[PDB]
Structures are given as structure tokens and as C-alpha cells.
Design a protein around this ligand. Structure first.
Ligand SMILES: *C(=O)CCCCCCCCCCCCC
Ligand SMILES: *C(=O)CCCCCCCCCCCCC
Ligand SMILES: *C(=O)CCCCCCCCCCCCC
Ligand SMILES: *CCCCCCCC[C@H](*)CCCCC(*)=O
Ligand SMILES: *CCCCCCCC[C@H](*)CCCCC(*)=O
Ligand SMILES: *CCCCCCCC[C@H](*)CCCCC(*)=O
Ligand SMILES: [Cl-]
Ligand SMILES: [Cl-]
Ligand SMILES: [Zn+2]
Ligand SMILES: [Zn+2]
Lengths: 29, 21, 29, 21, 29, 21, 29, 21, 29, 21, 29, 21
């Protein structure tokens, strides 16, 4: 799904700004 | 996961905190 | 230090494209 | 770390693939 | 609406590049 | 607002100028 | 000065996520 | 201004919230 | 089409990261 | 073009290489 | 040199918005 | 080149339009 890929692209940058020093994990599957 | 949660519905920053390390 | 914050903002997007369905763990310095 | 290596030197696709799951 | 949020994300960067020194205002509601 | 105008239809750069300060 | 222009490009996206429905007024230096 | 303060020092969420409406 | 414009926005940055020194060409029409 | 190919379906990085100079 | 890579990443997005349907040829240094 | 000119000096809309097709 292309639109799912687009939202995940915005999810990653949102997580990076929110978490910061702690870091984050992204796992679609 | 986060894709089924924060992409079908808009997540608050507090809900985004659940995926930090 | 802001320029590292900007560089990390580009790194996570690059990791998102490269990894795809595998996912990644972002751990900054 | 990825920041110490890729924010000082341009990391290619194959270098960035090292940090995937 | 998530897709509305995505377009607003691209609207902000388009406004920033277009306006420049004048600045801009974003107000969804 | 801009959301109802420049997201339902693609706005030109001239139309984007209407929202500068 | 370009690096400020890049920093401002990241600032507006950060403001977009933080403010949400409130909106913001971006006034550069 | 936001540029003079946040492009010299990393602004957190609570600092950036000062400039919202 | 707005959604087509959004995908092209992500296509350009993906091409830039993939191609690199060679450069790339984008042509919708 | 790339819009009809890599936007209707997700393209691999190898398929993206077809549009480099 | 990374900061040029970041600047080029913003340049292509700026070119994408400016050109629109015309398209562009990105040839880095 | 676009990099030598626009990454050292801020290019406006009309400068960037020079590199379109
Ligand atoms: C892996 O494929 C995840 C399994 C669930 C897929 C959900 C696809 C839709 C996700 C929502 C995207 C919203 C885009 C605005
Ligand atoms: C606040 O919610 C604004 C009221 C109107 C909402 C419009 C929602 C759809 C906006 C268009 C989004 C287009 C995305 C490509
Ligand atoms: C110029 O208009 C190209 C002709 C074909 C238009 C295709 C429009 C749809 C493109 C897919 C967009 C997918 C967004 C997730
Ligand atoms: C002087 C030019 C800008 C570079 C700043 C120095 C490099 C970053 C500091 C060292 C890295 C660790 C950052 C810790 O917070
Ligand atoms: C020398 C490293 C890059 C920093 C450039 C100097 C800081 C920006 C100039 C002062 C800010 C006002 C910009 C006005 O146009
Ligand atoms: C010292 C501050 C950072 C600027 C680095 C020097 C400018 C870029 C090098 C010259 C441009 C050509 C790059 C070739 O790979
Ligand atoms: Cl999008
Ligand atoms: Cl940057
Ligand atoms: Zn940047
Ligand atoms: Zn997007």
C-alpha cells in the first residue's frame, strides 16, 4: 500500500521529534 | 503495531511516546 | 547542537526507505 | 553509533543497511 | 482525518518556501 | 481556510501567497 | 545564509506537529 | 524570535509550544 | 490530483537518496 | 513515466534506479 | 561532505514545487 | 551548477526556476 508507506514516512519523523535522546523503534511487520 | 494504530487514526504525542525506546 | 539534530532527522528518513518492512532501531549518540 | 559515523561521513545505502532489523 | 493532516504537513513547507522573509500563518480551525 | 482550499485542489504559488504575513 | 533557511524549514514542520489544530504564526528573524 | 532561539539551541516540545496560537 | 502530487514529493527525495552523484530526472508529463 | 509506475505500486530501489541519470 | 547532501535534499524538494509539471534535471556538483 | 550557487547563497523562486525543464 503506497498510502500506508506515506503515513509511515511521516510517522518516523514524528517519532524522532517526540522521542529525541531515547530513540525509537519502527516495525511495520 | 504503530502502522495499524497511528495511521488509521491520528495519534496524540502521548500515544507516540509508546514507541520510544 | 542543532545541526546534528537536523542530520539525524535526515538519517531516520533514509533508514525508513532503506529498511522498508524490516524496520530499524534508531539509537542516537 | 549511526550519528557518529553518518553525520561526519556520507553513508551509502549499504552502510545504512547495517542498522536495519 | 489522517490524509488531511498529511496535506497540511506539505502545505506548511510550501508556504515557508513561498513566503520567506514575510512569514506565514497556518490555521486549520 | 487553507485546508479547505489548497488541499481539496492543488493551489498555484500565487494562491499560496494569500496566506503569507 | 542557507543553514538558517534549512533550520527554519525544520522548525515550521516541528511547529506544525506541536501546535496541531491551534495553528501558529511563523515570523523569522 | 523563534529562529534566534531554536536555531542556536535545541528547542524541546515545551519551548516550541510557546509559539503556537 | 493532490494525492498524486504528494507521492511525487516523496518520489523526488527517494530518487535523490538512491541516485546520488549521478543525479536524476523527474518528469510527470 | 515514474508517476504511473512508482506511485500506483511501491517500487523497489532497483526500480528507482531506472530514473537516475 | 554531509551538509551539502542535506542542502541538496532541500534543493530537489524546492525544485519539485517550483517546476511542477515541467519537471527538472538534478545534476549535483 | 545548482549546488555551487544555491547551497552557498539562498536562491529565490526565480533563481530555482532556471533549472526546470
Ligand atoms: C503491514 O502491512 C501492516 C499491516 C496493516 C496494514 C494497514 C494498511 C493501512 C495503514 C493506514 C495508512 C493510512 C495512510 C493515511
Ligand atoms: C478542519 O478540520 C478543516 C475543515 C475541513 C476539513 C477538510 C478535510 C479534507 C481536507 C483535504 C485533504 C486533502 C489531502 C490530500
Ligand atoms: C500526470 O498527470 C501523470 C498521468 C497519470 C496520473 C496518475 C495519477 C495517480 C498517480 C498515483 C498517485 C498515488 C498516490 C499515493
Ligand atoms: C563547530 C561546528 C558544529 C559542530 C559542533 C560540534 C560537533 C557536535 C558536538 C560533539 C557531538 C556530541 C553532541 C552531544 O550532545
Ligand atoms: C559561520 C557558520 C554559519 C553561521 C552564519 C552566521 C549566523 C547567521 C548570521 C546571523 C543571523 C542573521 C541572518 C540575517 O540574514
Ligand atoms: C567547513 C564547513 C563545511 C563546508 C565544507 C567545505 C565545502 C564543501 C567542499 C567543497 C565542495 C565540493 C564537495 C565535493 O565533494
Ligand atoms: Cl503524504
Ligand atoms: Cl539540514
Ligand atoms: Zn534538513
Ligand atoms: Zn507526505
Amino acid at each position: 500500500f503506497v498510502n500506508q508507506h506515506l503515513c509511515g514516512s511521516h510517522l518516523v519523523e514524528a517519532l524522532y521529534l517526540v522521542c529525541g535522546e531515547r530513540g525509537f523503534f519502527y516495525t511495520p511487520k | 503495531g504503530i502502522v495499524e494504530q497511528c495511521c488509521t487514526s491520528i495519534c496524540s504525542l502521548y500515544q507516540l511516546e509508546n514507541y520510544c525506546n
